[PDB]
Amino acid sequence: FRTFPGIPKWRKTHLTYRIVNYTPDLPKDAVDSAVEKALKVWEEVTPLTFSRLYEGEADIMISFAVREHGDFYPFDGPGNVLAHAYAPGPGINGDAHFDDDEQWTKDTTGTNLFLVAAHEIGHSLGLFHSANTEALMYPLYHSLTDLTRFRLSQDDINGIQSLYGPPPD
């Protein structure tokens, strides 16, 4: 595992999230599930908790965008960059943007939302790119057909617990 410079991390244990908009690619409740599922992955191995907001600014703002959206890093059309997120902090920090020029799916027939979400939210919680090929933080998005087999790798667990520790009890 690897962490950002000056090891940015949330100084609080309870974080809020907000799904700013929805993609035409999927039913709305499939986006919610993917996100809440992605949150569970991290929540389970740390004392971190999450709650949802539908107004105001949440710690982690989630949205779907195309090309040039609200920042200095415009998306790039089909394929390649799938999504991007900011390390812990105020404002756009912790925020996660997803490229809609991809076909987001609940399965592996295009770009699986849950898988990329899990990855991006890694970045939101302070994790950088791992060198371990079997890790979720590894920069390689494979069309991991076997979602049925997915398991957070010990490397990812090590890295997130380095910042927030194991669950309370």
Q: Which stretch binds Zn ion (CB under 5 A): 27-35, 42-50, 52-60, 64-72?
A: 64-72
| Residue 86 tokens, joined | 């900011």
What's the gap between Cα 137 and its chain centre?
10
Residue 120: active-site member: yes
Q: Which stretch binds Ca ion (CB under 5 A): 10-18, 48-56, 80-88, 157-165?
A: 80-88
The C-alpha atoms of residue 16 and residue 90 are separated, in whole angstroms, by: 12
The C-alpha atoms of residue 127 and residue 52 are separated, in whole angstroms, by: 22
By CB under 5 A, what part of segment 86-115 binds Ca ion? 94-95, 99-100
107 binds, among Zn ion, Ca ion, none (CB under 5 to 8 A by kind): none
Write down the catalytic residue from 36, 43, 120, 134.
120
Instruction: For residue 71, state whether it binds Zn ion (rule: CB under 5 A).
Output: yes
Q: Buried b / exposed e across 63-90, counting CB within 10 Å, b at 16+?
A: bbbeeeeeeeeebeeeeeebbbbbbbbe
Choose which of 76, 134, 143, 167 interacts with Ca ion (CB under 5 A).
76
Determine whether the annotation assigns residue 95 to a binding site: yes
97 binds, among Ca ion, Zn ion, none (CB under 5 to 8 A by kind): Zn ion
Close Cβ partners of 69 (under 8 Å, ≥ 6 residues apart): 63, 75, 97
Point out which residues bind Ca ion (CB under 5 A). 25, 76, 80-81, 94-95, 99-100
